[PDB]
Design a protein around this nucleic acid. Structure first.
Lengths: 122, 54, 136, 217
RNA sequence: CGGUGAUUGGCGCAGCCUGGUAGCGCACUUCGUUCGGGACGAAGGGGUCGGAGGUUCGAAUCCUCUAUCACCGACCA
RNA sequence: CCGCCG
RNA sequence: GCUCAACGGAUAAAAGGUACUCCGGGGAUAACAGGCUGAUACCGCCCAAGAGUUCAUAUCGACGGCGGUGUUUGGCACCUCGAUGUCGGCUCAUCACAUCCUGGGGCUGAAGUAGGUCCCAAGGGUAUGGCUGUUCGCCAUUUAAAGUGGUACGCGAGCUG
C-alpha cells in the first residue's frame, strides 16, 4: 500500500537511492498503489554518478511492498521494505539496466516483461 | 569591483528588465582612433635597418 | 455626438414628456423617419442612426436630422449616497413625442430610402415609421 | 554636409540634441530631418565615415585620419493607441488580500484584469470601493499597454540599429581623401567623385542613388 | 474621490494677491583676454504667462471649468 | 593676493 | 460701544482623548443578515459595419438597441440595539440549471482523431498537496471532470478560533 508522501527504496541501478511517491496515477481519488502500479515520484536522494539527479520528478512502478501481494490460493508475499523501479516519464520504460532484489509474478505484461527479464528472481 | 552604474543596470534588469546594452549603439569591429603619419623627429630617429657605420 | 456649443445653464430639470409632436411633416426632403413612440433620444443613438443611414445610402442624396439634443441629462456617480448636490452632466438627449419626424432624406429612390430608414430604426429605442412627403 | 543636403532637398533640419566640442568641432548631435522620403534617402548614411586630411589644429602637418559614426533611424511619433476592447477583457472581482477592516468580513472590492494580447494582468485592491478599483485598474491597464508599446517600438528599432553591425571593414564606408589626392569614395558601391568640396557642400545624392540601386538588385 | 495649492525665458525661481506697469541667476549670441580652451570682463537678445470661457474700457493677475503636477484626509463598526 | 587645463 | 457672522444673540471669559471606560435611551440611526429597487454586475436577445483568402451571420461581432436574473458593487433605512455571534477551515448537506463530465442532437471554415458553437437533458459523478488565517489566486502533479450559483455570502444550543 504505497500512498502519497511514502518513501521507497530503489530497485534498479538508475542512480536514485530513496524516492518519494507524490501521486498515485490512474483514477480519481485513488488511495493506494499495489505492485504492478505506476506512481509519480520525486528523487530525494541519489548517487553522484547517477543517470538521474536529486529532486527530479519522474515515473516509477512498484516491485515490492511490506503489505504484500495476495495469490489466488490465499498466500501473501510480504517483503521487508517497499522498493520501486524508476521508469521513464512518458514512455514508461525503466531507466536503469539492472535490477536489485526479487520481483513478483504481477509484473507479467510486456513493459514489465522488459523489467522482469533483468530481475534476478520472480 | 563592478561599477555603481553597472550595479544599477543589474538591479533594473532583474527587476523587470530591458537590457539597455541592446539599445546601445553598436561599435564597429575596428578601432576608430586618430591615425597620424609620423613626424620628422620620429622618422629622423626611427633607426630602421641598423646598417653599421663606415 | 451633437451637443450644444455654449449652452446657457449647465444642468436642467427632469420634466415630463407629454403631448404630441410639432414637426409632423416631411418638409426638407421627400422621405422621412417619423416617431410613433414616446421616449428620449441620446446623441449617441442619433449619431448611430445617422451613420447607418449614410452607410446605407452610400453618400448619395441629402440627409436631415430634424432633432438636436439640447437637454442635459445628469447622472449621479455610483457608490454615492442620495443628496449632497446634483449629478454630473453625462449625456444629452432630445425628448421625442409621437409624430416627430426624426430623419429626412432626398435624392434617393424610395425602396433604398426604406432600407436606409430600416437600418436606421434598428438602432433607436423608439418605435418609428416611414412617411412620405405630401403637398398641402 | 547633412544640413546643406537637407535644406537643398527642402527638408527641415530640427536639431533635437546638440553638444559642442571643447576646442573645436562637435561632441554629439541628434537631428530630426522632416521630409517625405527622408529615411528612404538617409538609409545610405549608416556606418562610419573616414576623413584623411591634414589637421589645421596640428602643427607638424601629420596626415590625420578620422572616423565619425553615423546612426540614422526613422522616427515614428505615432502615439496612436486608445483601447483593446475588441478582444476579451477577462475581468474578475474578488475579496482583496488584506486584514484590518471590513473587507475580509463583508464584501469584495478587488479587480483583476486579464488580456488575450500578451497576457496583461492587473490588480487594483485598495480603494474602499470596487468601482474605483475598476477605474484605476483601467488606468494601470493603459499604464503598461503604452509601456509595452514603447517596448515593441524599441525592440524593432534595436533590430534596425543592429541589422548589419557585424562586418569588419564593410561597416566603414565613405573615405574622404583630402590631402594626397582629394577623392570621395564609397566602399560598398565603388563610386567616387574627385571634387571633394562639392561633396562636402552636400552633393551626396549620387552616393545615395548608387547605394539604393545596389541594394535593389 | 474631494481639499488645497501650484503651471511665468531653454532650466530653477520672481512677479500674481492690488486689473493697466513681465524680471533674478544660470544658460544662449557677439566682442574682448589667451598659443588655444576654461575662468573673467563688455555689449545684446530672450516669454505674448497650462488650455478654454466669462467680469471690465482693460486680466499673466478676478472668477469659471478642463488638463498636468505635488501635499493632506479618504473614518467607526 | 588670485594664475586651472592642453 | 458687539464677523454677539452658530447672525432671535445661553457666559464678560472655554480645546481634546478614551480600545480603561460608565449610565439613560434608539432599530427614531449605522455596521452583519433579511426586505424594496436593479444604476452597476452577470446572463440572454435585436440591427448588422466589419473580420473570416471569396462570404455579415462556421466562429467573432463595432456603432447603437431590448430584456431577464437577483448574482456583484451599490441606493434606501422597512425588521431586529430589554443582543438576529463575523471571515476562513472541519463535519453534514439540500436545491437551481445559466451543464464541467458522462448521455442525445443541428451546423461547422466537420477528411479521421481532436475541436468550435448552439439545442435537449440535473440520474450519477465532479482532485490531492506547497504558500497564505485566508475565501480566492498562483504553482506542482493528477482526473472522464476537477461546474456555476442558492440555502442568515447553508452550517459555532455541531466543532475550531
Amino acid at each position: 500500500m504505497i500512498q502519497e508522501q511514502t518513501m521507497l527504496n530503489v530497485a534498479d541501478n538508475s542512480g536514485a537511492r530513496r524516492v518519494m511517491c507524490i501521486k498515485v496515477l490512474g483514477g480519481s481519488h485513488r488511495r493506494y498503489a499495489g505492485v504492478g502500479d505506476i506512481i509519480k515520484i520525486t528523487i530525494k536522494e541519489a548517487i553522484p554518478r547517477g543517470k538521474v539527479k536529486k529532486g527530479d520528478v519522474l515515473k516509477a512502478v512498484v516491485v515490492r511492498t511490506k503489505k504484500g501481494v495476495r495469490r489466488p490460493d490465499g498466500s501473501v508475499i510480504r517483503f521487508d521494505g517497499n522498493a520501486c523501479v524508476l521508469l521513464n516519464n512518458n514512455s514508461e520504460q525503466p531507466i536503469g539496466t539492472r535490477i536489485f532484489g526479487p520481483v513478483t509474478r504481477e509484473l507479467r505484461s510486456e513493459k514489465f516483461m522488459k523489467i522482469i527479464s533483468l530481475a534476478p528472481e520472480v | 569591483a563592478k561599477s555603481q552604474a553597472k550595479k544599477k543596470r543589474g538591479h533594473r534588469l532583474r527587476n523587470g528588465g530591458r537590457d539597455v546594452l541592446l539599445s546601445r549603439g553598436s561599435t564597429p569591429s575596428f578601432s576608430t582612433h586618430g591615425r597620424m603619419t609620423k613626424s620628422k623627429k620620429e622618422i629622423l630617429n626611427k633607426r630602421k635597418h641598423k646598417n653599421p657605420y663606415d | 455626438m451633437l451637443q450644444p456649443k455654449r449652452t446657457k445653464f449647465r444642468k436642467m430639470h427632469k420634466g415630463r414628456n407629454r403631448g404630441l409632436a410639432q414637426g409632423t411633416d416631411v418638409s426638407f426632403g421627400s422621405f422621412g423617419l417619423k416617431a410613433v413612440g414616446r421616449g428620449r433620444l441620446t446623441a449617441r443613438q442619433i449619431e448611430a442612426a445617422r451613420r447607418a443611414m449614410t452607410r446605407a445610402v452610400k453618400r448619395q442624396g441629402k440627409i436631415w436630422i430634424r432633432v438636436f439634443p439640447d437637454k442635459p441629462i445628469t447622472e449621479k456617480p455610483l457608490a454615492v449616497r442620495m443628496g449632497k448636490g446634483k449629478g454630473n452632466v453625462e449625456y444629452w438627449v432630445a425628448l421625442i413625442q409621437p409624430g416627430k419626424v426624426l430623419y429626412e432624406m432626398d435624392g434617393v429612390p424610395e425602396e433604398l430610402a426604406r432600407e436606409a430608414f430600416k437600418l436606421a430604426a434598428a438602432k433607436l429605442p423608439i418605435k418609428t415609421t416611414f412617411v412620405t412627403k405630401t403637398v398641402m | 554636409m547633412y544640413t546643406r543636403w537637407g535644406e537643398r532637398r527642402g527638408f527641415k533640419v530640427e536639431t533635437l540634441d546638440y553638444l559642442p566640442g571643447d576646442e573645436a568641432g562637435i561632441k554629439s548631435v541628434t537631428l530630426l530631418i522632416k521630409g517625405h522620403n527622408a529615411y528612404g534617402y538617409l538609409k545610405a548614411e549608416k556606418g562610419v565615415h573616414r576623413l584623411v586630411r591634414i589637421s589645421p589644429f596640428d602643427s607638424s602637418g601629420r596626415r590625420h585620419t578620422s572616423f565619425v559614426s553615423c546612426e540614422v533611424m526613422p522616427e515614428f511619433n505615432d502615439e496612436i493607441d486608445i483601447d483593446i476592447r475588441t478582444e476579451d477583457i477577462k475581468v474578475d472581482t474578488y475579496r482583496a488580500s488584506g486584514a484590518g477592516g471590513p473587507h475580509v468580513n463583508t464584501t469584495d472590492s478587488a479587480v483583476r484584469i486579464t488580456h488575450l494580447p500578451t497576457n496583461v494582468v492587473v490588480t487594483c485592491q485598495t480603494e474602499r470601493s470596487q468601482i474605483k478599483n475598476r477605474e484605476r485598474a483601467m488606468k494601470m491597464l493603459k499604464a503598461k499597454l503604452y509601456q509595452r508599446r514603447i517596448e515593441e517600438q524599441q525592440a524593432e528599432l534595436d533590430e534596425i540599429r543592429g541589422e548589419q553591425k557585424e562586418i569588419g571593414w564593410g561597416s566603414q564606408i565613405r573615405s574622404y581623401v583630402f590631402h594626397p589626392y582629394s577623392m570621395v569614395k564609397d566602399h560598398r558601391t565603388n563610386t567616387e567623385m574627385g571634387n571633394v568640396q562639392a561633396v562636402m557642400d552636400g552633393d551626396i545624392d549620387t552616393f545615395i542613388d548608387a547605394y539604393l540601386r545596389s541594394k535593389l538588385s
